[PDB]
Design an enzyme around this catalytic site. Structure first.
Site, mmCIF file in Angstrom:
data_model
loop_
_atom_site.group_PDB
_atom_site.id
_atom_site.type_symbol
_atom_site.label_atom_id
_atom_site.label_comp_id
_atom_site.label_asym_id
_atom_site.label_seq_id
_atom_site.Cartn_x
_atom_site.Cartn_y
_atom_site.Cartn_z
ATOM 1 C CG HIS A 53 -62.513 14.190 7.870
ATOM 2 N ND1 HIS A 53 -62.925 13.018 8.470
ATOM 3 C CD2 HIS A 53 -61.644 14.768 8.733
ATOM 4 C CE1 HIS A 53 -62.332 12.895 9.644
ATOM 5 N NE2 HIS A 53 -61.550 13.944 9.827
ATOM 6 C CG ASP A 55 -69.281 11.462 -0.559
ATOM 7 O OD1 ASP A 55 -68.468 12.024 0.202
ATOM 8 O OD2 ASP A 55 -70.459 11.844 -0.721
ATOM 9 C CG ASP A 76 -58.662 21.023 12.160
ATOM 10 O OD1 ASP A 76 -58.960 21.735 11.176
ATOM 11 O OD2 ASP A 76 -57.475 20.844 12.522
ATOM 12 C CD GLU A 81 -56.611 16.947 4.518
ATOM 13 O OE1 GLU A 81 -56.082 15.815 4.521
ATOM 14 O OE2 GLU A 81 -55.950 18.008 4.571
#
Ligand SMILES: [Ca+2]
Length: 433
Positions: free
Chosen positions: A359, A403, A57, A412
């Site tokens: 991610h 994956d 993020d 993560e």
């Protein structure tokens, strides 16, 4: 066979370059990343640009960011030879400075500190390149009316550790780092409270379990950076008052217990701390749950991060003279598992069959002007950019792994995930492994 720890160390540094927020330098190596979050600012418009995006993020979470800086600096101090041998000393220092330059900006007043830029929900609702963000990015702070001993304490530790790193190469900067470190510790110690009770947005992302360990951690680092006995006395007084000798072992962004113990053992040379460290390490090696293939399984979240952190504590314990050979060997087995001894690499951009769909937003994006949005997240294809160096969450308790970009448990990636890992790599290089 035979992993190139020097190159993995360089790779980890590339991961941190990929996590950089703000205006990027002309010598940036991860060039697919661009200038972003250039409007980050405090209540009065104070410049808050820079620092590291936390994970996949674009929120700047001060607590884990500070922890990351402290651990990276720690490895640079004890295993500088590892960085030099890998020709990455300058870059290692830059990785620490990227964080501390930001902490200095966030320290808007002696007893005021900004612990976050960007709101969890607004930030996470967006999937694309950071330079394309258009949503408001609120900045949250702690102060005398809204304390944060854990956040201020960890930041003080990071600043104190960095002051040591730069003591000779940049005395002026070293001095500045220390001034801020001293003030932030006083703020943390004189105004007791958990930062997540003030910066409430962080309570659902990086909630603090207890701030008492950070106070001891910070005091210990300040003693190391100043040689001022008052900090050692405070560190030890609080350690006894809080009874840390009986706290659950481990080192991570939330708990500094094991770090505090091995650190104090080195600073005081006292046998008591060494006993606590030995007990913890022997426990991990002999009893802690492990996957069938040998990976320490401490928790489902950031599994490899936990094993790598444990490996670093072991390497630090070895330096104290505690079962050096066996402790170093075991530490190496954990790092080696992450590198591929478990069947595949869990470090993106490295080794055999590594994760290709972390991610992570910025690495998933094609270059502009092509659109990057949730359809990109939803793409069946691997992330457009290889996120060289990032350590993913990892396999489950039975070494199973798939994956998947949507798997925010196993795939993560985060700055705290690579901290202990990177410092452990520096140690392995320093040891000639
Ligand atoms: Ca804590």
């Amino acid at each position: 066979m035979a992993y190139d720890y020097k190159q993995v160390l360089r790779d980890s540094l590339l991961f941190y370059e990929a996590q950089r927020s703000g205006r990027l330098p002309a010598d940036q190596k991860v060039t697919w990343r661009k200038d972003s979050a250039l409007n980050d600012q405090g209540d009065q418009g104070q410049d808050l640009t820079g620092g590291y995006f936390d994970a996949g993020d674009f929120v700047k979470f001060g607590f884990p960011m500070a922890y990351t800086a402290t651990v990276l600096a720690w490895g640079l101090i004890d295993f500088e030879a590892g960085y030099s041998s890998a020709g990455a000393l300058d870059d290692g220092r830059k990785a620490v400075k990227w964080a501390t330059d930001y902490f200095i900006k966030a320290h808007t007043s002696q007893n005021e500190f900004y612990g976050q830029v960007g709101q969890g929900d607004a930030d996470h609702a967006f999937w694309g390149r950071p330079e394309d963000m258009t949503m408001a990015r609120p900045a949250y702070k702690i102060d005398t009316s809204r304390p944060g001993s854990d956040l201020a304490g960890e930041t003080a530790a990071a600043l104190a550790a960095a002051s040591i790193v730069f003591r000779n190469v940049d005395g002026t900067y070293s001095n500045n780092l220390l001034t801020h470190a001293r003030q932030l510790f006083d703020f943390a110690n004189n105004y007791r409270g958990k930062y997540s009770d003030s910066i409430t947005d962080a309570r659902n992302f990086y909630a603090s379990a207890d701030y008492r360990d950070e106070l001891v951690w910070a005091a210990a680092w300040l003693y190391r950076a100043t040689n001022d006995n008052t900090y050692l006395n405070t560190a030890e007084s609080l350690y006894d008052e809080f009874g840390l000798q009986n706290w659950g072992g481990g080192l991570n962004w939330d708990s500094k217990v094991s770090g505090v113990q091995v650190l104090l053992a080195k600073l005081t040379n006292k046998q008591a701390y060494k006993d606590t460290v030995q007990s913890y390490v022997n426990y991990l090696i002999n009893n802690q749950q492990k996957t069938p293939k040998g990976l320490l399984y401490i928790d489902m979240w950031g599994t490899l991060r936990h094993a790598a952190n444990a490996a670093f504590i072991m390497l630090e314990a070895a330096e104290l003279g505690l079962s050096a050979s066996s402790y170093r060997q075991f530490a190496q087995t954990q790092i080696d598992y992450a590198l591929g001894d478990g069947g595949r690499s869990f470090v993106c951009g490295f080794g055999s069959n590594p994760p290709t769909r972390p991610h992570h937003r910025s690495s998933s994006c094609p270059p502009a002007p092509a659109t990057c949005d949730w359809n990109t997240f939803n793409s069946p294809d691997p992330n457009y950019h290889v996120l060289s160096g990032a350590l993913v969450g990892g396999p489950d308790q039975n070494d199973n792994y798939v994956d998947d970009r949507s798997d925010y448990v196993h795939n993560e990636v985060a700055t705290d995930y690579n901290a202990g890992f990177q410092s452990a790599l520096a140690a392995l290089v320093a040891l000639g492994y």
